Symmetry: C3
Subunit: 270 residues, 3 copies
C-alpha cells in the first residue's frame, strides 16, 4: 500500500515428469513459492519459460490487465525459452462514488499454468505448476509460520501416497495454512485438534461475527482458502493428523501430520 515490487519467476522441468515454478533458476518447487503482498502493492513478474513447451502464469483474485491473464487466447503465454513481464495489482477496500463498497484484494489466492497440456493448463497443473499467493490487509494478524497444502487430483503437493507432507510447530505458535485444490475431484479438508472460522481470514472478528466455526470443509478445483490456528491451543502437543475426509482418498494416501511439540521439543508418543 503501495510498493512496486519486482520479481522473477521460472517454469522448469523436474524429475519424474514434474514441472514447477521458482524464484530462481534451478530452484523450482512443487508447490511453487509463496508470493505475499499487501493491499495496494503492484508486482511486476519477469517470467521465463525454460521448458520445451509453451507455458504461462495465471493468478486468481488479483487485478491484472488482459495482457497478463496467461491464456493462449489473449496471446499472454510464453514460447519455449522466452520471457514476459506479467503485472499483478491489488487494491485497498473503499467507498466508490456511487456510495457502494469496493471489496479489496485481501485473501488467500493462487497462481498456476494455463496452457501446458490444454488451453486450461490441465497438464501443467497436474505436473506441478501451481503455488500460493497471500494478500494482507493493513492490520491483519501475521503468523509465525505459513504452510501450503494443495490437494492436486489424489495427491498432496504432488507427493507419492502416504508420504505427508508433515509440518512442525510448537504449542502456542500461530500457524497459517493456505489450502488450495486442483484437478478433477472434490475433497474435504480436515484437521484433528484444531478449528477455524469459515470467513476471509479464518479468524472471528469478535463476538458479533456469526460465521460457522468448522474443522472440515468441502473444496473443488481452484478453490483457495486460508486460516490461522494456535498450535495445540486447548489440546496440547501431539502428532495431529490432517487429511482428506473422503474415505477412499484418505485410505489411498491423502494424509499428513501436523507435529506439535512441547517447549522441550518432544511430542507425547511419536
Amino acid at each position: 500500500g503501495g510498493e512496486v515490487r519486482h520479481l522473477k519467476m521460472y517454469a522448469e522441468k523436474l524429475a519424474d515428469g514434474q514441472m514447477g515454478y521458482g524464484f530462481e533458476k534451478g530452484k523450482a518447487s512443487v508447490p511453487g513459492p509463496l508470493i505475499e503482498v499487501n493491499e495496494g502493492d503492484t508486482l511486476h513478474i519477469e517470467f521465463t519459460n525454460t521448458m520445451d513447451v509453451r507455458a504461462s502464469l495465471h493468478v486468481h483474485g488479483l487485478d491484472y490487465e488482459i495482457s497478463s491473464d496467461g491464456t493462449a487466447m489473449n496471446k499472454s503465454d510464453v514460447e519455449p525459452g522466452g520471457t514476459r513481464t506479467y503485472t499483478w495489482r491489488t487494491h485497498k477496500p473503499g467507498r466508490r462514488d456511487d456510495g457502494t463498497w469496493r471489496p479489496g484484494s485481501a485473501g488467500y489466492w493462487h497462481y498456476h499454468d494455463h496452457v501446458v497440456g490444454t488451453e486450461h493448463g490441465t497438464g501443467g497443473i497436474r505436473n506441478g505448476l501451481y503455488g500460493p499467493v497471500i494478500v494482507r490487509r493493513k492490520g491483519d494478524v501475521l503468523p509465525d509460520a505459513t504452510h501450503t497444502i494443495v490437494f492436486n487430483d489424489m495427491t498432496i503437493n504432488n507427493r507419492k501416497p502416504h508420504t505427508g507432507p508433515d509440518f512442525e510447530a510448537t504449542v502456542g505458535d500461530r500457524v497459517e495454512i493456505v489450502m488450495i485444490t486442483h484437478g478433477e475431484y472434490y475433497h474435504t479438508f480436515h484437521m484433528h485438534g484444531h478449528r477455524w472460522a469459515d470467513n476471509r481470514t479464518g479468524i472471528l472478528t469478535g463476538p458479533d461475527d456469526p460465521s460457522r466455526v468448522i474443522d472440515n470443509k468441502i473444496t473443488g478445483p481452484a478453490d483457495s482458502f486460508g486460516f490461522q490456528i494456535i498450535a495445540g491451543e486447548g489440546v496440547g502437543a501431539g502428532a495431529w493428523m490432517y487429511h482428506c475426509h473422503v474415505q477412499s482418498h484418505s485410505d489411498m494416501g491423502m494424509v499428513g501430520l501436523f507435529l506439535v511439540k512441547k517447549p522441550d521439543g518432544t511430542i507425547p508418543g511419536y
Copy 2:
C-alpha cells in the same frame, strides 16, 4: 412489498427435443425467463402445460403452500394441455413474537420442473425446464444488466460444448450474474478478472463484513447464488473467460466469454 402480480407461463417442447418455459407461447427459452419481485410481493402464475406429458413448476426459496409445490405427490403438477395457478409469496424480515429474527425471502433463487421424466424432474431439468428468480430487499443495489449462467450436467445453459454463452458489457457497467447448477455433477464456477463477496448479495456491506472475497466457488445440483461486479473494475477491457475449473469440464467445453468493451466498443486483441 407488497404488490400482487399476475403472470402467465407456459411449458413447451422444442423442435430439437428440449423443453423450456416462456411467458408467451412460441417464446420459450432455456434458461426460462427471469422472474424478479420485491420482498412482500405475491405472484400468481397461471401456468399452462402445452406438452404431451405431465409437467410442473417448483420454486426454491419462496413461500408457497403445499398445493403449489409442483410435486405429483401433492397433486400439484399439471396434465397435458392443462392449466393451474401457482401462488408464490415472499416476506420481509422482522422480529417474531418470541423475539427471534425471521430471515426474509431475499436472494437468488430458481424454479424448475419436478415431474417430467421422474418424480424429481430429472428429465425436465435435463431438457431445459429451469429458470432464475430474484427477490430484492428494499434498498438493494440494482444492476444495469442481469445474466443467467446455469451449469446443467456438462453444459452451460444446455448448449453444445465450446459454444458459450458469451455476454457483453462496457467497462464500468454494474453487471449481475445469477448462477445455478443442475443435474448430477459438482462444478466450480470461475471468472477471470473479477471477484465477489461470498454472501447473500455478492457485495460487502462495508468494512465490517468478514465474508470471503472469491473468484471461484464450488456448486452442486440446485445450488443458486448471485453477485454483482463492475465490469473491468481495475482490470480494463478484455475477452474475460468464465468457466468451470474442474479440468476435464473446461477441456470438454464448459467455457464462456464475458466481453468487456472500451467505451469505443473494442476489445484489446480483437479489433473489428
Copy 3:
C-alpha cells in the same frame, strides 16, 4: 458451563451386519445418540467396545488431548471387549492476551469411528458408527425437537432406498436439524417449504447479518451443519419433502418427508 459430566457409551455389532453406538448395551442406534453440552462443559465418556475388532470414538470440533483422538497411531483406540475413558472439553469464546478473539466450541459437530476397516474408520462409518454432537452457546435459542439427518454414501441414516426417515411436526414448532455427511460422495441437502441462514446457528442475528439464506447446500464427507426452522412458517401444513438434490441420488431413494400437521393432526391430501 462448566459442568463436568460422565457418560457411558458402547459400540455394538448389529444382527444385519451394521454397527452402532448407544448409551446402553442393547440400545445401539444409527445415527448414534445425540450428545449436547454447553460451552465450558467437560465430558468424560466411558466407552466400551463390545465388538470383536478394535474400535474408537473420534470427535470433530471439541477440545481433546492426543490421548483421546481415537486413532490407532496415538494408541487411542480400544481392544475388543475393552474400555477407555475419552475426555472432551469445550471452551467459551474470549479475547486472548494477544488481543485476538478465540472462537468458542459452539456448533454442530459429530463423532465417529476411526479404526474399523481401515485406520480412517472407513468400515466403521459405512456400517453406521456415527452420531451428532451439539455445543450450545449461552443465550442460544433452543428448539422443541432435534432431528439428525446423515447422508452416508447413498443412504439416509443407513436406511434402505425410499424408506425415509420421516419426521413429524406441527405448524409453529421450532425444529432443529443436524445434518452430517459421510462416505465417498458429495450431496446437496434440500428442503421444500423451508429455508435457513448459512452461518453457525442457521438463524440470522438480525438485519446486519449478510449471510446467505438458502434451502439447498452442497456437502461432502465429514461436513456437519445445523439449523432451526419454524415448521410451516408462511407455508402451512403439508408433506414437505427433503432430499438430496443430485438427480440420480433422489431418484434412487435419498428422499424423506417432513410432515407438518395442522392443529387437528392432519396433512393436506392425506387425512386418516
